[PDB]
Write a protein that binds this ligand. Structure first.
Ligand SMILES: *SS[C@H]1NC=C(C[C@@H](C(=O)O)[N+](C)(C)C)N1
Ligand SMILES: [Br-]
Ligand SMILES: [Cl-]
Ligand SMILES: [Mg+2]
Ligand SMILES: [Zn+2]
Length: 426
């Protein structure tokens, strides 16, 4: 039996540092998706995201603490209904949080009056929920979509089994080698790009929906990237967006999210349906891609920064980060934005279910090191995969000048003329 907080008391508490307001709905609803047909979607201004879905995760309590939600705080929970909050509030009280309220009236009361402040992930419609994808493939009517032509694409890196072992019904598979070169690990040339997309059945006016499957990347193995399918997907989204595919979506949390929602999976080897003309000059969005000359410019410019999205061991030069990279070190002058544990994991940018981490946290961490939207930013990692994921996050926030420096450490370290640092920073 939980305390209730009224609409009015809550409104008067929105600036209080001791109150933590916690949205227990899915991360996609938090982000903006109007999952119940609500007119204004997103979250109560200043609310944190803690999906009720995550209650079955053993590390639940560490997530909460890592979100800086403390027993001294006044916790106010809300969902689509008060009932979805029941289990969360119990769980809080069971772990020593004695000040816990539930707000009953988020929808329709808070959402359906414009005096009540809400916030949302500005380009949330590019980061789609499973149910939207289901709607799309089922012929159903769905929000944030006014197109007649789509294609669901399962990304992988030389591992068709990641697709054949189970995929979204009707999706075709795209190897990441179709759009990037194994020589440079950079995007392919315009001509190749054109030909590969045509042959994958994609025009500039097609709504492409990208996802991949997480298969527990193991650093020991020859091709750990073959198991990091949803990073690969976001990488391909980058390239398609650069190319000039106007509407690219990424399924949030990958294949995982589709199955977690209990939707059916296929094992067919779906053949491609080619199209003859992409229908647009490639690349339409060249500003998304930055190359080494420009990268160098950006390093000696107040207006701009390179953002290093690698692991800490890579950063200090303990490991190269991959088995085809010989040199260990970092690019001098970049801003570190620690990806996670190694080159095939993105823990700092993701939740345990692989969905994007609460965007406010990404924002504030980035802000603490001067990664801010008024700069031209180029995100990079070893070859551009984690760079892409970081870039995509910034993009989702509406950041006006974000890029991927494609070459990354692999390109930079391949010229022995290029300077580099190593060891613990100074
Ligand atoms: S951004 S460093 C690394 N993270 C995952 C990749 C992809 C890479 C790999 O599988 O190691 N390939 C596909 C070889 C570019 N980059
Ligand atoms: Br992944
Ligand atoms: Cl680096
Ligand atoms: Mg590259
Ligand atoms: Zn917000």
């Amino acid at each position: 039996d939980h305390t209730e907080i009224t609409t009015d008391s809550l409104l008067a508490l929105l600036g209080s540092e001791k109150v933590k307001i916690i949205d227990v709905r899915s991360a996609d609803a938090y982000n903006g998706w109007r999952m119940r047909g609500e007119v204004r979607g997103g979250h109560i201004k200043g609310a944190k995201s803690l999906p009720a879905k995550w209650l079955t995760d053993p590390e639940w309590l560490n997530i909460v603490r890592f979100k800086q939600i403390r027993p001294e705080d006044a916790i106010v929970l809300y969902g689509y209904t008060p009932e979805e909050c029941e289990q969360t509030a119990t769980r809080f009280k069971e772990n020593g949080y004695n000040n816990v309220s539930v707000f009953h009236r988020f929808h329709p009361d808070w959402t359906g009056n414009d005096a009540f402040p809400m916030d949302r992930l500005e380009q949330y419609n590019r980061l789609v929920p499973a149910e939207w994808v289901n709607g799309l493939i089922s012929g159903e009517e769905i929000p944030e979509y006014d197109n007649d032509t789509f294609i669901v694409c399962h990304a992988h890196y030389r591992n068709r089994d990641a697709y054949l072992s189970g995929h979204i019904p009707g999706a075709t598979d795209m190897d990441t080698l179709a759009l990037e070169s194994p020589e440079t690990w950079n995007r392919r040339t315009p001509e190749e790009l054109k030909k590969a997309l045509e042959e994958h059945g994609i025009t500039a006016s097609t709504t492409v929906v990208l996802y991949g499957k997480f298969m527990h990347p193991d650093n020991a193995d020859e091709f750990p990237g073959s198991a990091a399918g949803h990073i690969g997907a976001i990488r391909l989204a980058f390239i398609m967006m650069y190319a000039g595919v106007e509407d690219v979506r990424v399924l949030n949390g990958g294949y995982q999210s589709w199955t977690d929602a209990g939707f059916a999976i296929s094992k067919d080897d779906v053949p491609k349906t080619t199209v003859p003309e992409f229908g647009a000059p490639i690349p339409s969005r060249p500003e998304f891609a930055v190359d080494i000359d420009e990268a160098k410019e950006m390093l000696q410019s107040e207006d701009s920064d390179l953002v290093c999205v690698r692991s800490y061991p890579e950063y200090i030069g303990e490991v190269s980060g991959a088995n085809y990279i010989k040199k260990k070190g970092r690019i001098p002058g970049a801003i570190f934005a620690e990806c996670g544990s190694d080159a095939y994991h993105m823990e700092n940018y993701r939740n345990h279910d692989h969905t994007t981490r609460e965007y406010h946290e990404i924002e504030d961490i980035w802000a603490k090191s001067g990664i801010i939207p008024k700069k031209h930013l180029a995100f990079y990692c070893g070859t551009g995969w984690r760079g892409s994921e970081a870039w995509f996050n910034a993009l989702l926030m509406g950041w006006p000048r974000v890029s991927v420096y494609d070459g990354g450490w692999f390109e930079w370290s391949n010229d022995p003329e290029n300077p580099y640092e190593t060891g613990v920073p100074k």
